[PDB]
Amino acid sequence: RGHKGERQRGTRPRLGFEGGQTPFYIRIPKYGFNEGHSFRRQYKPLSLNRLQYLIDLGRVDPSQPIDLTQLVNGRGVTIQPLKRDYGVQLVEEGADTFTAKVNIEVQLASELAIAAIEKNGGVVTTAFYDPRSLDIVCKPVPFFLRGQPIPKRMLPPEELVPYYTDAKNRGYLADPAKFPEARLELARKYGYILPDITKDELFKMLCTRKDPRQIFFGLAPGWVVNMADKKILKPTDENLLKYYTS
Amino acid sequence: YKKKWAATEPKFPAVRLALQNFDMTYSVQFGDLWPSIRVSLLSEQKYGALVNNFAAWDHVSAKLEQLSAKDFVNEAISHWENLRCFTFDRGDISRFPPARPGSLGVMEYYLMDAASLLPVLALGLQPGDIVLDLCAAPGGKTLALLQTGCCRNLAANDLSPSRIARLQKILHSYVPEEIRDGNQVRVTSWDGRKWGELEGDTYDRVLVDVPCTTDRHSLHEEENNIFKRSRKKERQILPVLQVQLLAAGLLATKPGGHVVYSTCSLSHLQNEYVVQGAIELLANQYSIQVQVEDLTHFRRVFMDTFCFFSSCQVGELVIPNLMANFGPMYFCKMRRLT
Amino acid sequence: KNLGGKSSGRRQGIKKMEGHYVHAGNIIATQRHFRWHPGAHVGVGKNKCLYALEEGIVRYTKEVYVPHPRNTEAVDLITRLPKGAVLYKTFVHVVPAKPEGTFKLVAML
RNA sequence: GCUAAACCUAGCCCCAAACCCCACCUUACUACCAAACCUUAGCCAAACCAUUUACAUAAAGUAUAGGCGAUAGAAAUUGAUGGCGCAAUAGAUAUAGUACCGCAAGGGAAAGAAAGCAUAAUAUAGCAAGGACUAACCCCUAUACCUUCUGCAUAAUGAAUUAACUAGAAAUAACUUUGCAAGGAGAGCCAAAGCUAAGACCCCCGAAACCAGACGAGCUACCUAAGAACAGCUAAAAGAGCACACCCGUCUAUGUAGCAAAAUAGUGGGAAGAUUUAUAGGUAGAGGCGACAAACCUACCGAGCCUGGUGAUAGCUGGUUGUCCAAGAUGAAUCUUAGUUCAACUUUAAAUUUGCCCACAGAACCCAAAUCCCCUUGUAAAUUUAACUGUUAGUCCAAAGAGGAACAGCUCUUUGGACACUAGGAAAAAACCUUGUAGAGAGAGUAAAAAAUUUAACA
RNA sequence: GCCUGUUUACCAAAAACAUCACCUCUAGCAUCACCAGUAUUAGAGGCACCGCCUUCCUUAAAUAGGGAUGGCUCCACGAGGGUUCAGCUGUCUCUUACUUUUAACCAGUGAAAUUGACCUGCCCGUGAAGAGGCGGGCAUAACACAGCAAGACGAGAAGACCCUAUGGAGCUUUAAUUUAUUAAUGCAAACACCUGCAUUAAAAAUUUCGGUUGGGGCGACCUCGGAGCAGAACCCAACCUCCGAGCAGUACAUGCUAAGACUUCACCAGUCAAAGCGAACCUUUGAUCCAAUAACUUGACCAACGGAACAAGUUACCCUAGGGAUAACAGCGCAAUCCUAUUCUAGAGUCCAUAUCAACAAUAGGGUUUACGACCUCGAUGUUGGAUCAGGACAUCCCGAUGGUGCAGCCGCUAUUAAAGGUUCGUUUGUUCAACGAUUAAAGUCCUACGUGAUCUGAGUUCAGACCGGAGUAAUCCAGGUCGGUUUCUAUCUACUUUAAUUCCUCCCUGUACGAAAGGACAAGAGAAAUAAGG
Ligand SMILES: [Mg+2]
Ligand SMILES: [Mg+2]
Ligand SMILES: [Mg+2]
Ligand SMILES: [Mg+2]
Ligand SMILES: [Mg+2]
Ligand SMILES: [Mg+2]
Ligand SMILES: [Mg+2]
Ligand SMILES: [Mg+2]
Ligand SMILES: [Mg+2]
Ligand SMILES: [Mg+2]
Ligand SMILES: [Mg+2]
Ligand SMILES: [Mg+2]
Ligand SMILES: [Mg+2]
Ligand SMILES: [Mg+2]
Ligand SMILES: [Mg+2]
Ligand SMILES: [Mg+2]
Ligand SMILES: [Mg+2]
Ligand SMILES: [Mg+2]
Ligand SMILES: [Mg+2]
Ligand SMILES: [Mg+2]
Ligand SMILES: [Mg+2]
Ligand SMILES: [Mg+2]
Ligand SMILES: [Mg+2]
Ligand SMILES: [Mg+2]
Ligand SMILES: [Mg+2]
Ligand SMILES: [Mg+2]
Ligand SMILES: [Mg+2]
Ligand SMILES: [Mg+2]
Ligand SMILES: [Mg+2]
Ligand SMILES: [Mg+2]
Ligand SMILES: [Mg+2]
Ligand SMILES: [Mg+2]
Ligand SMILES: [Mg+2]
Ligand SMILES: [Mg+2]
Ligand SMILES: [Mg+2]
Ligand SMILES: [Mg+2]
Ligand SMILES: [Mg+2]
Ligand SMILES: [Mg+2]
Ligand SMILES: [Mg+2]
Ligand SMILES: [Mg+2]
Ligand SMILES: [Mg+2]
Ligand SMILES: [Mg+2]
Ligand SMILES: [Mg+2]
Ligand SMILES: [Mg+2]
Ligand SMILES: [Mg+2]
Ligand SMILES: [Mg+2]
């Protein structure tokens, strides 16, 4: 422990104290590096490399729509809603070697990632999730054990509304009339011939899109999932039905 | 060190200490004039306005006359035989508006103690005469000398770089580039005591404004008050420095040349003993004779604007008065006969 | 009665002795007044510090000093010299090491 | 062979479970007469202090608050009988809240089943031993230990001695070893080889204090009620004289662990008064009371005592317990110089590649010794990465200087050496000289290493 | 000081406090003090009864004593503080005898502080600077018992005093921050009382006491920069020697960006800068937070200039924790100062250097003063004087023996040698000293922890009380004057406890030598005393 002084006595000043000189961590001006950090939205990246790897190893089935639930179940991505994760962002990394036809739903998508997905004959849509809906989507089984009716998926905040109503982002709230134009624009820009997915034998699968207020593909808001006896209780009260449809 | 003492001195402020010194000395010196001098010193100071000859001199003079000030200098040279300083009448306390940059780009006038202009007018600046200011670098008399002619050469010296920088500031403000850049203006920061060796019998007209007790400012400002108790040693050695500087000026002036010893103090010690001791020292250690020239005509000429103490045998003393709070100013004209 | 005078040293002087390899921008020497003058491929800052303008080897030489004519005091000093006298100064040069580029084959059109 | 030594259960600790005749508030333990509720403060941290701090899991030490600093700090949401205990200085304080101490509040025990001596004093000389020796001593060598210091035999601290008890608690990040691995983890969290688990690492005693709430005016200060005492003489209705009882405490001596935590003997002051004194009652702690001495308030009152906050705090002092080896030594800021943080140094582990020495060439005008720089060469180290304590306002010697007095075992800066490390020498000996890397030897060669000097006739 | 009284229980009994008397200020009034009172009353403060006006003497000697609203007047009193006549006395010169206690031995009973271990000597030297323990010498069988108090820096309280701590506490304030609480008012609120909000006070409450330097003062400094110390890369202190600055002038690309570098030994901060873009064709001070601005940007101090947002004096009534890392006495260094001795003669000395004295200086030596250093001791050692007892040096004051002399004799002056012995009593003063009185053969200079308080004393000084004078707003303070004021120790160890006189005067020689006289010897001897030692 040394010899005498505060250090042998065990009473040396706090960490960061500099003997009275204005400490380094206080003499530096305050700057908004981390202002609002806990309210910034975070999106876990999903590179096309990782997506192709998952598809190749069979952990993600491209024959069915790929949403956040399927990604998590295949363990392709780890979402932490409590840490302000708002979902998954597609990432162009691996685009030049992506060769999978997939119907994938994500929260953000880069232009190049959209281009790769569409060139392979697939469909990509950016879908928003509030923190609660995101938690339920990422871990549905715990939610089903909570014994609560499936809630409605909330709409994007005002700042995010334009993003999800824009067709260039394949927003899930965007006018579907503008989608062919945007897809043709990407095909022209990136020099590939747009494949007419309507002719594909999986066109129905590629078209399936959950309703903007729907969390799970085949389950409607307000239903209760009784896993114990493999049943789905549906409300019939007019007020409840109106609420869960609104 | 001994912390506890039986008795400690009253701890006067420097202003009060200066007042006590003045009361114990000038009271004896002046008898019944001391109360008037005291009240004048303690009251506000009357500032004269010296127009800048390097600016719109006629326009500025017109503006000042509109402000009702009159040029006391103008109606003095006539009897005494470019300088124009406007001062208000006796008793008037009107201030002068703060100086502002003029049309030419230089300050129209300098607000300075009208008493700190008599030494300049008594030195007798003749055209084409080389002029020295041994230590006078508060501006003032220096700028007055500058605003005398465009056919004259002048050097100004002061040990203090701060005061030299102040001279430079006022020069850039008032003197134009033409004169300031020209050799007409030569400023230096050297010791005047050795100026006799630095230059000897070179200058024709010298002005020696030795550092003084500056009684009015001593009573006014506490900062750097010469009468602070600690600086008694410097106060005591002031006479030696004053004598040395006057001797250096008398050595530097040419034979037959003229010097003006100047002071901003009432002290007979710093006024007449300085000049007499300088004469003695410079006539013995250097065998050079100097004659004190009479300024009684100068006194009568400027009696209207200033009040002068007559009992002073050598030199002239402008004492402050409530009617004309212009003093103090002691000045003595000395011609080097050898 | 003597105050002040506690200023620390400026740590000036040569930073690169002769033969030292110097990259562009490296300060070669910091001086208060011109002890060493800039030579070839050596620049001068506001504060009269010498820095390398090219990447090379630092050399110190003695060369005749001919000041800029607009340097009036130096010109007068020269004007007062005798006919045979020539002023000299110590100059710092950077002998550039690499060539400033090479021509490469890019495409065989 | 005495004193003594020892012993094992009396009980206790932490969990789990379970919700546990008569007398007596008057002076308590006495048979029987006409009214509660109301913010804690402060210590402490902030290196003072003044706002402030200080009375399931996960989200998350997040949002927030804050001399925006010390630090404080959510919620939405999630859903959840046993003993690697003690065993009579331990474990409860406990055989007992007893004895005992205190007026009181209050404090609060102990215990039951070797040392020291004696047998047998002692012999020149000496840290009490060691080398030895035929032999105890005699011979030679040898300046106790701890702590604090530049440096201690030091005439600096602590220790009579024995037994028992008595002092390093933990994170962040690392490193090591497993597991699994672009994933790890038994939800939450982390992840651009990570994640998970484990291993390793942060003392003891001590103030004067502050505040809260009690307890104290059986001493003492003053006061209230109702009592009592004051001979004799002199003087006459007395804050009168002398002088008993009584009260006090001037001076001296004694005593000073005492007869006494303020006494004794003599001497002395008052002794009908503002006197002394018994009884009961009152005033309570920032308060009372005070013929103000900072006097007194239960022996220690410039602010009582007890309990609690409290294991207060202490940059200050002291202490900090097995063996063995290894590496290891002299700037800046700071209410700061008795401290700390950063640097430098130091230690460990790791990476890869130059490191030191170093000639020539080279480094200024103004107005010496040397230094810097690096091809070789002698060498094997250096840099970087990770982690990190501690030392960090020293001494003397040689040298260049400054201050002082061309004093100081004096005070400063610089280069170097030595000391704080072994040994030999210079008498003893930190700092001068020789010399170092460790063991055994009843071998050998050496190093430094011992002061020298004696002196007045005269043509 | 009027008086009698009171007070620091346990170091101060006093001049301090009170006190009648007097003065000043405040109050016009009842049902719990004042007060069951009412201005001749009550409360508080000051002041001090009362009354009247505005160099000599003492001694023999005398640092003592007495006398030549304000200014005086002391009646009485006093364990107050000084001085004195006379007396008295063992206070003393100068101590002795006896009794009792204690004591020592015998018997019984039987502690305490203390204690590293000790097989515990002296001298010199050394050393953390003071040695029983180390070096060199000397001494040395072993043990009781009784004394002593020189040492064991002896034992007692983490002594006294001094310094430090971002340790306490007390006191005072024009230190800082508050007015919660009361008292006044004002504004609302209820129609005297009460609530809320403001302002001003009173009373208090909380908190702080920067740093470095300075012994005889009346402060200076604290940040930055230039020069020397520090000569030649860099770097280098100081109460070190000097100097300078807290910006201005200029322009308004004095813009934006960016390789690579420097760096005040850390960080913070601070510098330089190619290329590029854009216009054109510059030479020092300060952080964070906080505020203000729409923002760009800007501000206050933070000069104790790495910056507490806002806090001073004082403490001897003090306390705690420490410090010999830091003062005073003392020890130890040093020798400026001081003292001594030689060399030189300037010179004085009637001339005359050297009978004697001595300048400017030089060279040695000492460790007696005044200082300097901060090395030992701050985990019970005040200091000065005095008493007692002294050990030692000789640089000799007397006594002894000599040389010279400006020594005829006596006398001196000077020098050499000599440390065996000796070296007074009084007045003032606490005094060491000093002055004075009277002596003496002489009344020596010093060291010994300015020897010696476990032997004594406490008069000065030093602690708690109080005055005078002074400083300070006050609390308080003071190198000053004064009155008062607790001095513990039973001895374990070392050491020690029985080791051939000196002077003076008288006389003889002898009023002899010598000398003109005056004066006046030696050497030798006798007698008286006195002291010292031993009986
Ligand atoms: Mg320790
Ligand atoms: Mg330390
Ligand atoms: Mg310097
Ligand atoms: Mg604190
Ligand atoms: Mg919750
Ligand atoms: Mg027990
Ligand atoms: Mg035994
Ligand atoms: Mg010891
Ligand atoms: Mg100690
Ligand atoms: Mg002890
Ligand atoms: Mg009572
Ligand atoms: Mg009677
Ligand atoms: Mg009576
Ligand atoms: Mg009383
Ligand atoms: Mg008092
Ligand atoms: Mg007192
Ligand atoms: Mg008590
Ligand atoms: Mg503690
Ligand atoms: Mg080792
Ligand atoms: Mg500070
Ligand atoms: Mg400290
Ligand atoms: Mg009295
Ligand atoms: Mg008493
Ligand atoms: Mg009493
Ligand atoms: Mg008494
Ligand atoms: Mg007497
Ligand atoms: Mg009395
Ligand atoms: Mg007995
Ligand atoms: Mg000795
Ligand atoms: Mg000893
Ligand atoms: Mg004995
Ligand atoms: Mg102590
Ligand atoms: Mg640096
Ligand atoms: Mg500061
Ligand atoms: Mg500072
Ligand atoms: Mg020292
Ligand atoms: Mg001791
Ligand atoms: Mg002799
Ligand atoms: Mg002495
Ligand atoms: Mg006394
Ligand atoms: Mg006193
Ligand atoms: Mg006194
Ligand atoms: Mg006295
Ligand atoms: Mg007395
Ligand atoms: Mg005694
Ligand atoms: Mg005894």
Tab-separated table of C-alpha atoms (C1' of nucleotides) in Angstrom, chain E residues 216-390:
chain	number	residue	atom	x	y	z
E	216	G	C1'	13.534	45.125	15.214
E	217	G	C1'	8.135	45.932	10.983
E	218	C	C1'	3.933	49.356	9.184
E	219	G	C1'	5.058	45.003	3.507
E	220	A	C1'	6.374	42.610	-1.228
E	221	C	C1'	4.861	38.953	-4.511
E	222	C	C1'	1.269	35.204	-7.194
E	223	U	C1'	-0.126	35.260	-14.788
E	224	C	C1'	2.818	35.958	-19.466
E	225	G	C1'	7.271	37.417	-22.074
E	226	G	C1'	12.887	39.139	-23.169
E	227	A	C1'	18.271	38.953	-21.309
E	228	G	C1'	22.146	36.539	-17.653
E	229	C	C1'	22.932	32.591	-14.259
E	230	A	C1'	22.435	28.410	-18.396
E	231	G	C1'	29.240	30.479	-23.353
E	232	A	C1'	28.318	25.484	-28.187
E	233	A	C1'	21.184	20.586	-29.636
E	234	C	C1'	17.173	20.965	-26.068
E	235	C	C1'	16.498	21.515	-20.980
E	236	C	C1'	17.550	23.645	-16.562
E	237	A	C1'	16.029	27.181	-9.603
E	238	A	C1'	16.235	31.375	-6.571
E	239	C	C1'	13.978	35.549	-1.068
E	240	C	C1'	18.881	35.444	-7.663
E	241	U	C1'	20.640	40.045	-11.353
E	242	C	C1'	17.877	43.314	-14.962
E	243	C	C1'	13.800	44.575	-18.358
E	244	G	C1'	8.847	44.438	-20.307
E	245	A	C1'	2.929	43.169	-21.013
E	246	G	C1'	-2.066	42.903	-19.861
E	247	C	C1'	-2.734	45.744	-26.008
E	248	A	C1'	-2.545	48.768	-29.877
E	249	G	C1'	-2.046	49.906	-35.323
E	250	U	C1'	-3.751	47.714	-39.747
E	251	A	C1'	-6.991	45.639	-42.817
E	252	C	C1'	-11.776	43.553	-43.077
E	253	A	C1'	-9.969	36.677	-47.633
E	254	U	C1'	-6.691	39.777	-41.561
E	255	G	C1'	-11.425	33.600	-45.790
E	256	C	C1'	-12.546	27.933	-46.147
E	257	U	C1'	-10.196	23.614	-46.260
E	258	A	C1'	-6.086	20.374	-45.702
E	259	A	C1'	-0.749	16.608	-46.211
E	260	G	C1'	3.064	16.762	-42.646
E	261	A	C1'	5.206	18.581	-38.396
E	262	C	C1'	6.599	21.588	-33.588
E	263	U	C1'	5.250	22.042	-28.594
E	264	U	C1'	7.337	25.319	-22.741
E	265	C	C1'	9.214	18.779	-20.034
E	266	A	C1'	2.081	15.698	-18.320
E	267	C	C1'	-2.891	17.179	-19.839
E	268	C	C1'	-5.233	21.497	-20.923
E	269	A	C1'	-3.748	24.833	-23.979
E	270	G	C1'	-0.286	26.902	-27.747
E	271	U	C1'	2.564	27.044	-32.668
E	272	C	C1'	4.028	26.285	-38.248
E	273	A	C1'	2.297	24.562	-42.762
E	274	A	C1'	2.618	22.333	-48.761
E	275	A	C1'	-1.345	21.075	-51.886
E	276	G	C1'	-6.613	22.536	-52.941
E	277	C	C1'	-10.962	25.964	-53.131
E	278	G	C1'	-12.284	31.324	-52.765
E	279	A	C1'	-11.018	36.703	-52.861
E	280	A	C1'	-7.368	39.338	-54.416
E	281	C	C1'	-2.105	40.665	-56.728
E	282	C	C1'	-1.236	41.674	-41.474
E	283	U	C1'	3.032	42.893	-36.820
E	284	U	C1'	0.057	38.073	-25.122
E	285	U	C1'	-2.960	36.341	-22.503
E	286	G	C1'	-8.319	33.098	-18.689
E	287	A	C1'	-10.736	26.976	-18.961
E	288	U	C1'	-15.660	24.665	-17.487
E	289	C	C1'	-20.382	25.624	-15.981
E	290	C	C1'	-23.640	29.603	-16.369
E	291	A	C1'	-25.973	33.345	-18.763
E	292	A	C1'	-27.459	36.641	-23.334
E	293	U	C1'	-28.449	36.145	-28.884
E	294	A	C1'	-32.972	33.139	-33.810
E	295	A	C1'	-28.245	31.846	-34.834
E	296	C	C1'	-23.776	33.459	-36.104
E	297	U	C1'	-21.641	34.868	-31.841
E	298	U	C1'	-21.065	37.602	-27.063
E	299	G	C1'	-20.315	38.679	-21.625
E	300	A	C1'	-18.993	38.942	-15.886
E	301	C	C1'	-15.466	38.078	-13.144
E	302	C	C1'	-12.369	34.234	-12.481
E	303	A	C1'	-4.855	39.103	-11.660
E	304	A	C1'	-4.821	33.858	-5.510
E	305	C	C1'	-4.294	34.860	-13.521
E	306	G	C1'	-5.616	25.567	-14.120
E	307	G	C1'	-10.206	29.815	-12.326
E	308	A	C1'	-14.351	27.706	-4.699
E	309	A	C1'	-20.649	31.299	-7.599
E	310	C	C1'	-21.058	34.006	-3.052
E	311	A	C1'	-17.127	34.032	3.568
E	312	A	C1'	-12.928	38.794	7.536
E	313	G	C1'	-10.483	39.970	12.183
E	314	U	C1'	-9.296	37.415	16.801
E	315	U	C1'	-8.081	33.418	20.953
E	316	A	C1'	-2.909	33.641	26.776
E	317	C	C1'	-9.729	30.664	27.976
E	318	C	C1'	-8.376	27.640	24.111
E	319	C	C1'	-8.791	22.202	22.181
E	320	U	C1'	-7.212	17.809	18.947
E	321	A	C1'	-3.893	15.514	15.542
E	322	G	C1'	1.001	15.836	14.521
E	323	G	C1'	5.969	18.006	13.660
E	324	G	C1'	12.861	18.446	15.767
E	325	A	C1'	10.476	17.847	7.868
E	326	U	C1'	9.942	23.915	11.751
E	327	A	C1'	11.129	28.621	15.804
E	328	A	C1'	13.337	30.222	21.191
E	329	C	C1'	17.235	28.234	25.689
E	330	A	C1'	20.678	24.623	25.114
E	331	G	C1'	24.063	21.159	21.945
E	332	C	C1'	26.678	21.026	17.238
E	333	G	C1'	28.933	23.601	12.695
E	334	C	C1'	30.937	28.664	11.072
E	335	A	C1'	34.082	32.524	12.445
E	336	A	C1'	31.356	37.722	9.505
E	337	U	C1'	31.602	39.936	14.430
E	338	C	C1'	34.539	39.251	18.759
E	339	C	C1'	39.345	38.142	21.416
E	340	U	C1'	44.680	37.004	21.416
E	341	A	C1'	49.686	36.711	19.368
E	342	U	C1'	53.269	37.907	15.707
E	343	U	C1'	55.305	40.903	10.731
E	344	C	C1'	55.689	46.294	8.863
E	345	U	C1'	57.262	50.414	10.508
E	346	A	C1'	53.400	55.324	9.276
E	347	G	C1'	53.782	57.255	13.299
E	348	A	C1'	53.720	59.147	18.175
E	349	G	C1'	57.132	58.482	22.468
E	350	U	C1'	61.213	66.392	24.084
E	351	C	C1'	65.101	63.761	19.436
E	352	C	C1'	64.694	58.441	19.668
E	353	A	C1'	60.309	52.984	15.595
E	354	U	C1'	60.671	48.990	18.743
E	355	A	C1'	61.498	51.359	27.377
E	356	U	C1'	56.167	52.142	26.070
E	357	C	C1'	52.135	52.787	22.689
E	358	A	C1'	50.223	52.643	17.744
E	359	A	C1'	47.574	53.605	11.926
E	360	C	C1'	46.973	51.121	6.962
E	361	A	C1'	47.545	46.321	6.317
E	362	A	C1'	49.593	40.902	6.360
E	363	U	C1'	49.916	36.039	8.864
E	364	A	C1'	48.456	32.749	12.433
E	365	G	C1'	45.505	31.000	16.729
E	366	G	C1'	40.924	30.798	19.978
E	367	G	C1'	35.594	29.623	20.117
E	368	U	C1'	34.354	33.714	25.741
E	369	U	C1'	29.895	38.099	22.484
E	370	U	C1'	26.587	39.678	18.580
E	371	A	C1'	24.811	36.849	14.366
E	372	C	C1'	24.181	32.917	10.692
E	373	G	C1'	22.674	27.266	9.674
E	374	A	C1'	18.125	24.174	10.846
E	375	C	C1'	21.885	18.804	11.999
E	376	C	C1'	19.966	15.942	17.544
E	377	U	C1'	16.007	16.433	20.875
E	378	C	C1'	8.645	18.987	20.545
E	379	G	C1'	5.613	10.276	22.996
E	380	A	C1'	6.741	15.872	30.820
E	381	U	C1'	13.848	18.585	30.456
E	382	G	C1'	11.098	26.516	30.807
E	383	U	C1'	14.844	30.469	31.317
E	384	U	C1'	17.731	34.209	34.079
E	385	G	C1'	19.913	35.350	38.601
E	386	G	C1'	21.046	33.513	43.668
E	387	A	C1'	22.339	29.260	47.222
E	388	U	C1'	25.499	24.608	47.667
E	389	C	C1'	29.463	22.236	45.844
E	390	A	C1'	32.778	23.096	42.672
